[PDB]
Amino acid sequence: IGSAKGELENLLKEVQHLKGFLDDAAKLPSDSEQWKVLVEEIQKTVHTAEDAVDKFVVQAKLHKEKNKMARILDVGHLATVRNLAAEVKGIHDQVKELRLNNQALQARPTLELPQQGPALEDDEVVGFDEEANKVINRLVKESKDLDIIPVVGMPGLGKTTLARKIYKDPKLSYEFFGVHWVYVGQSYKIKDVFLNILKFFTRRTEDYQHEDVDALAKVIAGFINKGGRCLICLDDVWETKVIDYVKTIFPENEKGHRVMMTTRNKVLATYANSDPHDLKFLTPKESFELLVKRVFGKKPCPKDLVGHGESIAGKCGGVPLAVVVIAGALRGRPNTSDWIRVERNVVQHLYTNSEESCLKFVEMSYDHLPQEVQTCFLYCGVFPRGFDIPSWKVIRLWIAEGLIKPQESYTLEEIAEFYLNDLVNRNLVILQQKRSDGQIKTCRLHVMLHQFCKKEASNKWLFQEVSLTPDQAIDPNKSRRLCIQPSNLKDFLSKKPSAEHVRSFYCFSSKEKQIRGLTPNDIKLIHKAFPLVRVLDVESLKFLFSKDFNQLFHLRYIAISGDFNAIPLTFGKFWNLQTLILNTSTSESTLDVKADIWNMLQLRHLHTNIPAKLQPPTATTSGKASCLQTLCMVAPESCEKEVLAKACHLKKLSIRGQMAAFLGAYKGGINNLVELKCLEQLKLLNDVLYMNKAPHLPQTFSQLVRTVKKLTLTNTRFAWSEADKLGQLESLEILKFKENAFAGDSWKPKMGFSALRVLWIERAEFETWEASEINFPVLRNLVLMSCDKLETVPFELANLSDLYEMRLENTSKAVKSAKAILESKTDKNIKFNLTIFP
């Protein structure tokens, strides 16, 4: 190739300038339509330049793949390269014209250039009676030390309303000499906060205005000492510095002073109190009651509007702020037509209107985010509203979208995990599913937060939901990525879509396993529509590997399903592929990975729903260690010395098959596991129910997986004496036995698991269990489920200090022993939780 490399480089520099401008404009608040048009044009120009460069790189790589004879004799390559160079030159001319003509594209040194409601009467507050009672009981408990009870929750959940309800409660007056309210806020000055606190004790604050912060703290402490027990309410705390400053205004008189603070941050609340108070969500009934109180005040709802109102209140997610905004939409419109209109799209009516109260309140928390976490938050709105987002899937989508910039000491997966946990801690992501590690398993976006992400991503052109009003298309040409539900897929494809600029295609099955009437021609049309697609995350389909699919060389993420007997060699030409998630309905016991994954240097995660029969690297493929981090459902046959050596950086590994033929001496494929350097999770599964002999844990197993933190055994059918071998694992932290992993009437462990935190037993047909303290010194969780034959969980566990959680699911008489242990620990007054189902 000639000068086109220099043209590419110059275009990249200019596009870097344009992207810097776009990042800057994302900060600038704009009310000008011409500014909006210019930013749209620059975004489109950046996208076009990126697509052109990517096409050029792909063509150069494909040419270099071809042999020298084919390289010379391919005139079609010459025509394509000339066309791509012409396109690059045109885009570069456009970018230069953009920068030259517009004075807004001039760089500037430092120049980006950027009250509560009426007052609720105690009957205007809905559903907070029990919550207020709980917080009041916590506040009025006698204790010598200062105690902070933080009320924490998502924006507009009612933290300030509950704090005001408690602050006005008569009960507090009997217990506390002084009950003061202080508003801190995000932007606050501690001198002002202390002066406001001082007003509650002296009316001569015009005398103390000249004092310093510490002097004012001492003055307030003396006043409180003169008074007695005091409760100071801090509103809207966004830093720990406030908590630390306020600790200094309370005298050490052992009276039991209190602070009730409200915050959106769970980490700040956990600093304030190891047990922060999570404000509840209103029930649908309470939501409807609040809606009726907001719309009709004290008058009852008209009968004809009750059904619509109940529908509307249930669509607000139980967050009072949403109900208040929707009420503002329904105020003074007792007509059924207006209520039907609002019911049709309630989340839209949040963030619209001047009373868009959701927008500014959500933006309070949003602006507090770092840029990477900000962008990662928006891509949570790529899932359907109400979708139970898998944490692993969203993490891998963030990484595949380039949202996570690599850091020196952390893997991209670790950074993404931290970002997701930070979003949950800031109460911007709802988490209802916990892994045994204590990490997020599935998360969710609240309807109001989801609508915020959906609008913000559309404003920033990150992605866009394909929504059709009977016919028509809504500008799909104004979106880098497209999300479409399976119901709307057929209609969209019937238009014969052709969007080169679209880079990610999302089809999420919220109604799981509702594969609609999509034909192979529709899948081929999907392939045709997006040739530059980087992320293809569509698992509700019967995907087929057409010849057009083999040309999606830009892919970084694929989540597909169908009837695949093997991964074709064509997958090996996706040199950008990072995540490969497969779900094959084929009856074949294992999936043949024909693709030479080892030469896919970018590949990090491979997920298959049946065991994968990998191929050992050839002598040519030898080189550096592979980037692979996850290898799920790998057949024991494929765990060879070379396979494991190339993937020595593997972190999660799952094996399923004939384990017996894997734990033997000449079966040292198990011994090949030593090649791994950072193996954290290991799943060992057995498929056969009839066993020639009961397998055995090799004596080498202790140091074969010494780095493993999570170990899962399934259908292994091991003698309970074989569990003693797992105690020699130094890093074993979470341990799972499921589906008759260990066989035997009783388990009498002797070895102690030095670091085990979570013990997990499922469907264990054992009868008795005589563990002791030495066996699990640092146990923290004990999850037994489907243990219909277990007799009694040993009392010896009751003496374990760190143990504070234990769940018995579908458990026999052993439940009674769990009650006995709970009773003993309650007698000792140790924080403990015991869950029983049903």
Ligand X SMILES: Nc1ncnc2c1ncn2[C@@H]1O[C@H](COP(=O)(O)OP(=O)(O)OP(=O)(O)O)[C@@H](O)[C@H]1O
State in angstroms the smallest separation of the CB of 362 from ligand X.
9
Number of residues near a copy of itself (by CB under 8 A): 102
Compute CA 270 distance to the chain's CA centroid, rounded to the nearest angstrom. 20
Lookup: tokens for 82: 């000339």
Stretch that binds ligand X, among 107-115, 154-162, 388-396, 819-827 (CB under 6 A): 154-162
| Contact flag: residue 318 with ligand X (CB under 6 A) | no
| Contact flag: residue 452 with ligand X (CB under 6 A) | no
Residues 628-687 that bind a copy of itself (CB under 8 A): 649
State in angstroms the smallest separation of the CB of 109 from a copy of itself.
4
Lookup: tokens for 489: 């897929």
Stretch that binds ligand X, among 124-132, 211-219, 565-573, 663-671 (CB under 6 A): 124-132
Residues 231-290 that bind ligand X (CB under 6 A): 236, 262, 264, 290
DSSP state for residue 797 in the 8-state scheme: G
**Burial 30-65, CB ≥16 within 10 A → b, else e:** eeeeeeeebbeebbbbbbbbbbbbbbbebbbeebee
Is 727 annotated to bind a ligand? Reply is no
Partner whose footprint covers residue 160, from a copy of itself, ligand X, none (CB < 5 to 8 Å by kind):
ligand X
Distance CA 784, CA 834 (A): 11
Question: Alpha carbon of 279 to those of 78, 134, 209, 262: distances in Å?
Answer: 66, 11, 36, 10
Is 175 annotated to bind a ligand? Reply is no
Is 770 annotated to bind a ligand? Reply is no
Is 158 annotated to bind a ligand? Reply is yes
Compute CA 335 distance to the chain's CA centroid, rounded to the nearest angstrom. 41
State in angstroms the smallest separation of the CB of 116 from ligand X.
6
Question: Alpha carbon of 747 to those of 476, 722, 763, 796, 821: distances in Å?
Answer: 62, 10, 14, 14, 19
Cβ closest to ligand X, residue 350 vs residue 650: 350
Exactly one of 11, 98, 155, 381 binds ligand X (CB under 6 A); that residue is: 155
* DSSP count for the chain of H helices, then E strands: 27, 30
Distance CA 707, CA 732 (A): 8
Q: Identify which of 181, 268, 263, 273 has the alpha carbon closest to the alpha carbon of residue 230.
A: 181
Is 203 annotated to bind a ligand? Reply is no
Question: Alpha carbon of 201 to those of 145, 228, 242: distances in Å?
Answer: 21, 11, 20
Q: Are 810 and 786 in contact (CB under 8 A)?
A: yes
Q: Are 528 and 552 in contact (CB under 8 A)?
A: no
Is 352 annotated to bind a ligand? Reply is no
Exactly one of 46, 55, 127, 561 binds ligand X (CB under 6 A); that residue is: 127
State in angstroms the smallest separation of the CB of 434 from ligand X.
24
Amino acid at 377: F
Distance CA 385, CA 510 (A): 9
Partner whose footprint covers residue 299, from ligand X, a copy of itself, none (CB < 5 to 8 Å by kind):
a copy of itself
Partner whose footprint covers residue 127, from ligand X, a copy of itself, none (CB < 5 to 8 Å by kind):
ligand X
Show Cβ contacts of residue 135 under 8 Å, excluding neighbours closer than 6 positions: 149, 151, 162, 166, 260, 277
Q: Are 620 and 645 in contact (CB under 8 A)?
A: no
Cβ closest to ligand X, residue 287 vs residue 792: 287
Q: Are 761 and 783 in contact (CB under 8 A)?
A: yes
Exactly one of 66, 144, 241, 285 binds a copy of itself (CB under 8 A); that residue is: 241
Unique residue bearing structure tokens 């090949």: 672
Is 466 annotated to bind a ligand? Reply is no
Q: Which H or E run contains 390?
A: strand 389-390
Cβ closest to ligand X, residue 422 vs residue 733: 422
| Contact flag: residue 587 with a copy of itself (CB under 8 A) | no
Q: Is the peptide bond before 838 cis (omega within 30 degrees of 0)?
A: yes
Partner whose footprint covers residue 290, from ligand X, a copy of itself, none (CB < 5 to 8 Å by kind):
ligand X
Cβ closest to ligand X, residue 282 vs residue 782: 282
Exactly one of 3, 69, 76, 111 binds a copy of itself (CB under 8 A); that residue is: 111
Show Cβ contacts of residue 290 under 8 Å, excluding neighbours closer than 6 positions: 126, 127, 282, 313, 320, 323, 324, 327
Is 241 annotated to bind a ligand? Reply is no
Stretch that binds a copy of itself, among 9-17, 477-485, 592-600, 713-721 (CB under 8 A): 9-17
Lookup: tokens for 290: 């609040």
Partner whose footprint covers residue 270, from ligand X, a copy of itself, none (CB < 5 to 8 Å by kind):
a copy of itself
The maximal CA–CA distance of the chain, rounded, in angstroms, is: 97
State in angstroms the smallest separation of the CB of 371 from a copy of itself.
10
Number of residues near ligand X (by CB under 6 A): 23
Q: Are 2 and 88 in contact (CB under 8 A)?
A: no
State in angstroms the smallest separation of the CB of 770 from a copy of itself.
26
Stretch that binds ligand X, among 88-96, 120-128, 549-557, 624-632 (CB under 6 A): 120-128
Exactly one of 1, 28, 515, 688 binds a copy of itself (CB under 8 A); that residue is: 28
Cβ closest to a copy of itself, residue 65 vs residue 93: 93
**Burial 752-772, CB ≥16 within 10 A → b, else e:** bbeebbbbbbbbbebbebebb
Residues 489-518 that bind a copy of itself (CB under 8 A): 494
Residues 355-394 that bind ligand X (CB under 6 A): 361
State in angstroms the smallest separation of the CB of 466 from a copy of itself.
11
| Contact flag: residue 151 with a copy of itself (CB under 8 A) | no
Amino acid at 690: Y
Distance CA 278, CA 774 (A): 36
Residues 517-576 that bind a copy of itself (CB under 8 A): none
Residue 794 has, within 13 A of its CA and on its CB side, a CA count of: 17
Cβ closest to ligand X, residue 124 vs residue 147: 124
Partner whose footprint covers residue 304, from a copy of itself, ligand X, none (CB < 5 to 8 Å by kind):
a copy of itself
Residues 59-118 that bind ligand X (CB under 6 A): 117
According to DSSP, the residues that pair with 560 across neighbouring strands are 582
Give, rounded to a whole angstrom, the gap between the first and last alpha carbons of the chain: 70
3-state helix, strand, coil in the chain (%, to 5): 40, 15, 45
Exactly one of 106, 477, 620, 829 binds a copy of itself (CB under 8 A); that residue is: 106
State in angstroms the smallest separation of the CB of 658 from a copy of itself.
32
| Contact flag: residue 298 with a copy of itself (CB under 8 A) | yes
Exactly one of 88, 125, 305, 538 binds ligand X (CB under 6 A); that residue is: 125
Is 341 annotated to bind a ligand? Reply is no
| Contact flag: residue 126 with ligand X (CB under 6 A) | yes
The binding track of 704-743 with respect to a copy of itself, each residue x by CB under 8 A or -, is: ----------------------------------------
| Contact flag: residue 625 with a copy of itself (CB under 8 A) | yes
Exactly one of 142, 254, 408, 827 binds a copy of itself (CB under 8 A); that residue is: 408
| Contact flag: residue 170 with a copy of itself (CB under 8 A) | no
Q: Which H or E run contains 736?
A: strand 734-738
Residues 749-808 that bind a copy of itself (CB under 8 A): 778, 801-802
Q: How many CB atoms lie within 10 A of CB 500?
A: 15
Stretch that binds a copy of itself, among 21-29, 666-674, 792-800, 822-830 (CB under 8 A): 21-29
Is 712 annotated to bind a ligand? Reply is no
Dihedral over alpha carbons 469, 473, 478, 481 (to 10 degrees): 90
Partner whose footprint covers residue 585, from a copy of itself, ligand X, none (CB < 5 to 8 Å by kind):
none
Binding site as annotated, residues for ATP: 124, 126, 156-161, 264, 294
Binding site as annotated, residues: 124, 126, 156-161, 264, 294
List residues binding ligand X (CB under 6 A): 117, 120, 124-128, 153, 155-161, 236, 262, 264, 290, 320-321, 324, 361
